[PDB]
mmCIF file of C-alpha atoms in Angstrom:
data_model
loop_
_atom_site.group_PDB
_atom_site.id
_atom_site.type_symbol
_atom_site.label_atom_id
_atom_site.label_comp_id
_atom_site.label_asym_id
_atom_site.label_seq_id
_atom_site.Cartn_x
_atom_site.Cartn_y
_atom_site.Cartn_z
ATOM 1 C CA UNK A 1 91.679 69.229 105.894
ATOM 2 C CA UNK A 2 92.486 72.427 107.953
ATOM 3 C CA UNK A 3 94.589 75.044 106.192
ATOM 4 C CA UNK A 4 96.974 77.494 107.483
ATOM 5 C CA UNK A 5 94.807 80.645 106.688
ATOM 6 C CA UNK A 6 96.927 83.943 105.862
ATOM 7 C CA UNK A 7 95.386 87.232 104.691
ATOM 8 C CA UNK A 8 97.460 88.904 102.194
ATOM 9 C CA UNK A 9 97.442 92.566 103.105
ATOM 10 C CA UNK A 10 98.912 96.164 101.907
ATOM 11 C CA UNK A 11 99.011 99.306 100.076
ATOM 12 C CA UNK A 12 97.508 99.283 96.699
ATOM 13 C CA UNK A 13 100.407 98.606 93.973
ATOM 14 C CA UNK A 14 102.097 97.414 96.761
ATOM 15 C CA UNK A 15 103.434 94.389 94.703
ATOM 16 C CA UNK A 16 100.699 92.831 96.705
ATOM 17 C CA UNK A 17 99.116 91.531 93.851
ATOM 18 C CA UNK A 18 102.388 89.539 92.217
ATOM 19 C CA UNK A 19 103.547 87.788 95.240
ATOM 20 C CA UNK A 20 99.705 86.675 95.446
ATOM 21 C CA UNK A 21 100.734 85.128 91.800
ATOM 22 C CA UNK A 22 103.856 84.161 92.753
ATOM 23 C CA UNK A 23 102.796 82.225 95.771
ATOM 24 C CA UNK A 24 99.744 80.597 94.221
ATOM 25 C CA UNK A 25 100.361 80.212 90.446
ATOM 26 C CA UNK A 26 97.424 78.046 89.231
ATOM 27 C CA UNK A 27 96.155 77.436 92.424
ATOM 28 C CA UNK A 28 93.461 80.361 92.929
ATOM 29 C CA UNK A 29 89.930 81.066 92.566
ATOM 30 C CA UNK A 30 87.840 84.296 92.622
ATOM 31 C CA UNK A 31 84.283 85.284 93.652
ATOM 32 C CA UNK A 32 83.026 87.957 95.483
ATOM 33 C CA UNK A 33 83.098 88.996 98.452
ATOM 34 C CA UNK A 34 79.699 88.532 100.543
ATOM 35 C CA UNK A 35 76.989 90.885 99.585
ATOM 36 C CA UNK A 36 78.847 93.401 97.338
ATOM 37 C CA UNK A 37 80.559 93.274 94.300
ATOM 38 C CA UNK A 38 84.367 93.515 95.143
ATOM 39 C CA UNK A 39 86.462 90.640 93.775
ATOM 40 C CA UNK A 40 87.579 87.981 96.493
ATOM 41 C CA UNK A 41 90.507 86.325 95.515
ATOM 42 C CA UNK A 42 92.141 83.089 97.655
ATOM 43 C CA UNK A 43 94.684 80.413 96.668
ATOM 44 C CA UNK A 44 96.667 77.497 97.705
ATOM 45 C CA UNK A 45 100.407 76.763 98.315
ATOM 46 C CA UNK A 46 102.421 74.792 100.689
ATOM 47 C CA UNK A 47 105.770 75.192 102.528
ATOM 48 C CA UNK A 48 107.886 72.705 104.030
ATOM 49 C CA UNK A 49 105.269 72.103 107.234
ATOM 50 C CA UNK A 50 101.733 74.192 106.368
ATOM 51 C CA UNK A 51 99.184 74.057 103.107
ATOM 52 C CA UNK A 52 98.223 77.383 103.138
ATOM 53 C CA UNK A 53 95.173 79.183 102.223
ATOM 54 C CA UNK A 54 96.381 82.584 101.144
ATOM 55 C CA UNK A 55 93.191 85.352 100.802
ATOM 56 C CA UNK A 56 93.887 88.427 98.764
ATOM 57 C CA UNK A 57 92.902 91.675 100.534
ATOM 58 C CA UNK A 58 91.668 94.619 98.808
ATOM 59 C CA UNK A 59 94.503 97.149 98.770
ATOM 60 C CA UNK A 60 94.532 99.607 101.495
ATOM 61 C CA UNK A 61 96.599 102.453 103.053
ATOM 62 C CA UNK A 62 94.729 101.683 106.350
ATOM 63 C CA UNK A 63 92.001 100.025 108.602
ATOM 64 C CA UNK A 64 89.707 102.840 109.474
ATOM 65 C CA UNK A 65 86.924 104.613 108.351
ATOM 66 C CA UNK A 66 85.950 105.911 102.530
ATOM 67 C CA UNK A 67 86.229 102.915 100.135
ATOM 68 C CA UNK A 68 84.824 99.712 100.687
ATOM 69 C CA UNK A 69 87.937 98.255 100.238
ATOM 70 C CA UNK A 70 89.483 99.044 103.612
ATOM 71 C CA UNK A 71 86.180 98.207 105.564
ATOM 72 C CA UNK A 72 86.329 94.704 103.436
ATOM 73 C CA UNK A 73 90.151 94.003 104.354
ATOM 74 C CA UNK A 74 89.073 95.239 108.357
ATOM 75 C CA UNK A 75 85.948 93.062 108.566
ATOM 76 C CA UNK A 76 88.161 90.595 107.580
ATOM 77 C CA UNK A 77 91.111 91.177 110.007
ATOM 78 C CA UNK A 78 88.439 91.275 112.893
ATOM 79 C CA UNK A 79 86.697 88.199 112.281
ATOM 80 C CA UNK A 80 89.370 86.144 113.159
ATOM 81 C CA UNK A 81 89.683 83.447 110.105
ATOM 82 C CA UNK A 82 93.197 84.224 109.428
ATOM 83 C CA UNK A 83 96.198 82.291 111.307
ATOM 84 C CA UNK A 84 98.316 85.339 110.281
ATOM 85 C CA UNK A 85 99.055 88.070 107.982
ATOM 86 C CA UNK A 86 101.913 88.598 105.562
ATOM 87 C CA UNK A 87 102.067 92.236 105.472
ATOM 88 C CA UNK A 88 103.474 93.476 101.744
ATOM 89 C CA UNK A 89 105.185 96.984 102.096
ATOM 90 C CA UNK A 90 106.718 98.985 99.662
ATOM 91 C CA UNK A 91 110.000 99.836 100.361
ATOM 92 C CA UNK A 92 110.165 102.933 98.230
ATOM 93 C CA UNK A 93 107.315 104.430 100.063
ATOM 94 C CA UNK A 94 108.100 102.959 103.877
ATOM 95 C CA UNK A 95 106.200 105.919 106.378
ATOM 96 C CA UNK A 96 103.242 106.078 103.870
ATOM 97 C CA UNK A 97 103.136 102.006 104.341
ATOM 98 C CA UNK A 98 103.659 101.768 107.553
ATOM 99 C CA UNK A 99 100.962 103.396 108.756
ATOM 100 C CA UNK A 100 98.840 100.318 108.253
ATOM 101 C CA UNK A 101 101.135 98.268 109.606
ATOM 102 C CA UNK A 102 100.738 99.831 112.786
ATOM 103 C CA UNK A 103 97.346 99.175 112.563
ATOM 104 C CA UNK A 104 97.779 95.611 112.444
ATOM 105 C CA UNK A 105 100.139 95.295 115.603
ATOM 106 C CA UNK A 106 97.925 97.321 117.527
ATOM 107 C CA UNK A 107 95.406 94.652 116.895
ATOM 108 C CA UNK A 108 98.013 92.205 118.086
ATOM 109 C CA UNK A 109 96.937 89.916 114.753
ATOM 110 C CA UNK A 110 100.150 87.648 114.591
ATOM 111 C CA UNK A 111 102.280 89.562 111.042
ATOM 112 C CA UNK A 112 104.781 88.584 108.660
ATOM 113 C CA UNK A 113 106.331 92.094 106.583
ATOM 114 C CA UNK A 114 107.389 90.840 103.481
ATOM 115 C CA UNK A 115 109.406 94.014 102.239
ATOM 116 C CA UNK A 116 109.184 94.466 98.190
ATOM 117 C CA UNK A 117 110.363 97.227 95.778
ATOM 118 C CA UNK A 118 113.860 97.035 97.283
ATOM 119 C CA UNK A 119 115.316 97.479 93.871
ATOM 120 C CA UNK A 120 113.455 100.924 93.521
ATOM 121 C CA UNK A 121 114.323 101.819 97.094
ATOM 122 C CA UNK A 122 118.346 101.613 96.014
ATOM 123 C CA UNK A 123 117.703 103.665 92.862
ATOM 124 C CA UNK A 124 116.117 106.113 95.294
ATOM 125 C CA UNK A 125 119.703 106.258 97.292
ATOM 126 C CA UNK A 126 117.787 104.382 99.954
ATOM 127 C CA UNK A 127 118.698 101.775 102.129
ATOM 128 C CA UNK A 128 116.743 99.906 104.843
ATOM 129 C CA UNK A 129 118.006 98.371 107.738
ATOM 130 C CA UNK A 130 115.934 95.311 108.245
ATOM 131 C CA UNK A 131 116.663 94.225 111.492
ATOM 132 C CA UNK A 132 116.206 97.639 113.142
ATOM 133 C CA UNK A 133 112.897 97.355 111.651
ATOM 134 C CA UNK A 134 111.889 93.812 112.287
ATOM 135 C CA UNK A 135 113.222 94.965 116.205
ATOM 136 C CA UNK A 136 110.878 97.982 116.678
ATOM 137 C CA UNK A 137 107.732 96.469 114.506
ATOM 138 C CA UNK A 138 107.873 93.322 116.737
ATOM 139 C CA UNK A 139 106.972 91.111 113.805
ATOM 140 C CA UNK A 140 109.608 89.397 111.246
ATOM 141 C CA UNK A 141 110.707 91.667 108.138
ATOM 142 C CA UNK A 142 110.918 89.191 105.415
ATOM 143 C CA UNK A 143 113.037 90.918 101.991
ATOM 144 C CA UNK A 144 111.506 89.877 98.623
ATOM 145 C CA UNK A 145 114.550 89.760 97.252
ATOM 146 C CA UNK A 146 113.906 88.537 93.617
ATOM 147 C CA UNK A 147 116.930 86.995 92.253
ATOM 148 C CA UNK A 148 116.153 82.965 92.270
ATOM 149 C CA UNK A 149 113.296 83.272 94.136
ATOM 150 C CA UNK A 150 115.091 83.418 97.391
ATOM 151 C CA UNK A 151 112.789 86.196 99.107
ATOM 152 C CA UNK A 152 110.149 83.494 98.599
ATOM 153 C CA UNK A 153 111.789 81.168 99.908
ATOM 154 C CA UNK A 154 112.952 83.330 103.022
ATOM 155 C CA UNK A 155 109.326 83.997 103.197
ATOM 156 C CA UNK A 156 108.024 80.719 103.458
ATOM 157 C CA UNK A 157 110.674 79.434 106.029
ATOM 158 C CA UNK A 158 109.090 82.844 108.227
ATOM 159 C CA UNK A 159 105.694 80.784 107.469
ATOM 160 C CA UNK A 160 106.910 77.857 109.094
ATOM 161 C CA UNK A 161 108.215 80.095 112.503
ATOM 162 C CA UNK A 162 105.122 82.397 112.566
ATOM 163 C CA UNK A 163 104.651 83.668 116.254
ATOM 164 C CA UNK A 164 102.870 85.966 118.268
ATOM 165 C CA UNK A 165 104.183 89.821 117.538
ATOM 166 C CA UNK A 166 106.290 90.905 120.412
ATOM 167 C CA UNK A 167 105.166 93.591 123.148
ATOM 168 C CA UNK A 168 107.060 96.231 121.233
ATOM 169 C CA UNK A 169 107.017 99.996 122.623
ATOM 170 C CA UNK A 170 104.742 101.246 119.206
ATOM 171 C CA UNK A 171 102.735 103.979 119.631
ATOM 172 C CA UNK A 172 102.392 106.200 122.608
ATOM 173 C CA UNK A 173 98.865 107.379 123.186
ATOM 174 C CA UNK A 174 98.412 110.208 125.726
ATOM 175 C CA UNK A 175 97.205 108.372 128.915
ATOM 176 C CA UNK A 176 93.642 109.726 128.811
ATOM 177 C CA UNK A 177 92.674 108.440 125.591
ATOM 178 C CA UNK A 178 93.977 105.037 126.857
ATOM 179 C CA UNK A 179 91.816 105.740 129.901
ATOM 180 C CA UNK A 180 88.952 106.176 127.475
ATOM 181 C CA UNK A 181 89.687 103.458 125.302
ATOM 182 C CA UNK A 182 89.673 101.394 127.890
ATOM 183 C CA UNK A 183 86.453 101.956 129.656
ATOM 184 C CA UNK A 184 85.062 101.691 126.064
ATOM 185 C CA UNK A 185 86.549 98.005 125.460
ATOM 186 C CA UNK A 186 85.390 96.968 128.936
ATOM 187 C CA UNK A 187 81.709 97.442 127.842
ATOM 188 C CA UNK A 188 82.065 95.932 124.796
ATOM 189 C CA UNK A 189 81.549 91.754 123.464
ATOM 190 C CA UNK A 190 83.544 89.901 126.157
ATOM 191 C CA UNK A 191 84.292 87.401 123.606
ATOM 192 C CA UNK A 192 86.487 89.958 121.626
ATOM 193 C CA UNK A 193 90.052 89.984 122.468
ATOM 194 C CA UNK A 194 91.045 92.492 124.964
ATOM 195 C CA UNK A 195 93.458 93.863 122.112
ATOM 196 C CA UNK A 196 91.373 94.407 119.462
ATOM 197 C CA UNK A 197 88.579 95.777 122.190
ATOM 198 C CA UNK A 198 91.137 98.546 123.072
ATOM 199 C CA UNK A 199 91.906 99.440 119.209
ATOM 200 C CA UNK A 200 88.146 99.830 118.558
ATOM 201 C CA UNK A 201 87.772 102.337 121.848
ATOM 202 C CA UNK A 202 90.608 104.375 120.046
ATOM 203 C CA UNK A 203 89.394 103.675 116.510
ATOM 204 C CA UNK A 204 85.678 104.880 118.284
ATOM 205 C CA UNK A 205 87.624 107.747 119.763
ATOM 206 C CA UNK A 206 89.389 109.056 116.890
ATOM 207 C CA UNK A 207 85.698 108.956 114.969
ATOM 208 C CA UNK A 208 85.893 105.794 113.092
ATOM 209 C CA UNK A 209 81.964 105.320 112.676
ATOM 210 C CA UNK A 210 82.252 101.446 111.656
ATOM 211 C CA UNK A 211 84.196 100.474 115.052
ATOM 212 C CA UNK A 212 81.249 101.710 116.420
ATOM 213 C CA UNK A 213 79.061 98.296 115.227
ATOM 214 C CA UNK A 214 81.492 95.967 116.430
ATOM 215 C CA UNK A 215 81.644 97.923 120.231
ATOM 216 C CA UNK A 216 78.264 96.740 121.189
ATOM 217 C CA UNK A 217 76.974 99.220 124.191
ATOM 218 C CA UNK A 218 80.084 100.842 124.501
ATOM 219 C CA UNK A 219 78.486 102.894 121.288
ATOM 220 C CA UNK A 220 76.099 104.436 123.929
ATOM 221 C CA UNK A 221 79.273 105.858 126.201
ATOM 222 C CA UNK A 222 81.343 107.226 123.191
ATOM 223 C CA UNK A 223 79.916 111.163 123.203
ATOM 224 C CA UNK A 224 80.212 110.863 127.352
ATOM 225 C CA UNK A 225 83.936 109.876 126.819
ATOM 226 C CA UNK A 226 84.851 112.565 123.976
ATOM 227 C CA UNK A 227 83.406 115.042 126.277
ATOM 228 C CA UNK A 228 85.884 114.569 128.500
ATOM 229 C CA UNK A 229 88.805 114.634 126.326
ATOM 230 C CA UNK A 230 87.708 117.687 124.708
ATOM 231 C CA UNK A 231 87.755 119.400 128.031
ATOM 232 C CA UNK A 232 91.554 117.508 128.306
ATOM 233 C CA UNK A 233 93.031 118.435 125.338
ATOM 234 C CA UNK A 234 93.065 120.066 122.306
ATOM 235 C CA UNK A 235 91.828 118.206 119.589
ATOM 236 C CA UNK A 236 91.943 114.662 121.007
ATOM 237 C CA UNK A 237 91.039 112.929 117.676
ATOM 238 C CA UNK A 238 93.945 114.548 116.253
ATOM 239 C CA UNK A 239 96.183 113.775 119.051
ATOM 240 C CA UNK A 240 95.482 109.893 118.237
ATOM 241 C CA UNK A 241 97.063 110.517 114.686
ATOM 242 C CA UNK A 242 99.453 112.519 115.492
ATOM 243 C CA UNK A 243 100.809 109.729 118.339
ATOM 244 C CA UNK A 244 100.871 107.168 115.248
ATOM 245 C CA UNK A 245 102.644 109.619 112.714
ATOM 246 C CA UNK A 246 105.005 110.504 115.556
ATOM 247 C CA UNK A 247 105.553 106.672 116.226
ATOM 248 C CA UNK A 248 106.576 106.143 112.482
ATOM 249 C CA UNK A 249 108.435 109.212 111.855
ATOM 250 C CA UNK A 250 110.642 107.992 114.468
ATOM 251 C CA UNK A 251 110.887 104.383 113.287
ATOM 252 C CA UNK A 252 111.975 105.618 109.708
ATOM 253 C CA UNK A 253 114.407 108.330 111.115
ATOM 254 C CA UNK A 254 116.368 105.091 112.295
ATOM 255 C CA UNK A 255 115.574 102.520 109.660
ATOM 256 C CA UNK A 256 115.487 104.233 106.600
ATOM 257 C CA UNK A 257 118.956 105.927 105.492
ATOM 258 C CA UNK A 258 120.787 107.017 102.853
ATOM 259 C CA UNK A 259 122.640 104.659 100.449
ATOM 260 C CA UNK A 260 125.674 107.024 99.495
#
């Protein structure tokens, strides 16, 4: 029978790792993951429509590349097993998390946040104003709220709704290195989503040299298109960051406030 396949996805000590348990209980194996030694982890649970297949990613603060767990939880993003992604962010530590959250919608991979450490985020005097976030994020922002197992609940129910992320304003690249990007992702495998084409020419851009393998011949164009930049701008690699840091900053300025 065809599951509903999720990939489970965040920071390390995210409390990524306990809502895996939580989810699955009993209902888990582990191998490997092909060709290296890096445990692969993947359970079973149901909600009130979907059996789910729910596959543990290796904990990572982002997507590019330098640790073979973030090219393992990429290669995985980009192959395009999962249905969706539940997103696990620590509330405590929001513009740290976020940044590969962004990551994610930029792919346009459909997202769940489930929002954890909520508890620690109060002692911190800090609040989070969840719909403000779920608003500029595009995606649903789930609370794990652990009192009687209701954020689990709240999180399943979000299961059963899943949707495509919304065309959200996120992060506001200077218009030549979407030029760039561009005429990267038109040379690469048609059979790649336009989205995810566009995220490598960036991810190419900004020196990522693993995008480069999944770009095909746009590879060949990549030191032709930086040339250009650099005569641009300043620093265009850096000016891809900084648009993304910028992007969050802004987010959090809003979302995030103080409790008192």
């Amino acid at each position: 029978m065809k599951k509903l396949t999720i990939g489970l996805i965040g920071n390390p000590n995210s409390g990524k790792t306990t809502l895996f348990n939580q989810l699955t209980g009993s209902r888990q194996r582990v191998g490997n993951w092909a060709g290296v030694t890096v445990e692969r982890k993947e359970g079973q649970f149901s909600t009130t429509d979907h059996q789910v297949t729910l596959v543990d990613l290796p904990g990572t603060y982002s997507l590019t590349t330098t640790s073979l767990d973030e090219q393992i939880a990429c290669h995985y993003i980009l192959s395009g097993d999962a249905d969706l992604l539940i997103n696990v962010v620590d509330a405590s530590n929001l513009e740290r998390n976020l940044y590969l959250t962004l990551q994610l919608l930029e792919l346009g991979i459909p997202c769940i946040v489930a929002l954890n450490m909520l508890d620690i985020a109060e002692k911190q005097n800090i609040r989070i104003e969840i719909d403000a976030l779920s608003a500029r994020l595009g995606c649903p922002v789930i609370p794990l709220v652990s009192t009687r197992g209701r954020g689990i609940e709240a999180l399943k129910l979000a299961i059963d709704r899943y949707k495509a992320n919304e065309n959200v304003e996120l992060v506001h690249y200077a218009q030549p290195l979407l030029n760039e990007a561009d005429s990267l992702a038109k040379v690469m495998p048609s059979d790649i989503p336009l989205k995810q084409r566009r995220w490598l020419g960036l991810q190419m851009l900004e020196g990522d040299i693993y995008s480069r393998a999944y770009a095909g011949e746009a590879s060949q164009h990549l030191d032709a298109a930086l040339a250009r930049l650099r005569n641009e701008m300043d620093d265009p690699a850096l000016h891809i960051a900084d648009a993304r840091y910028q992007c969050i900053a802004a987010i959090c300025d809003v979302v995030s406030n103080t409790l008192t």
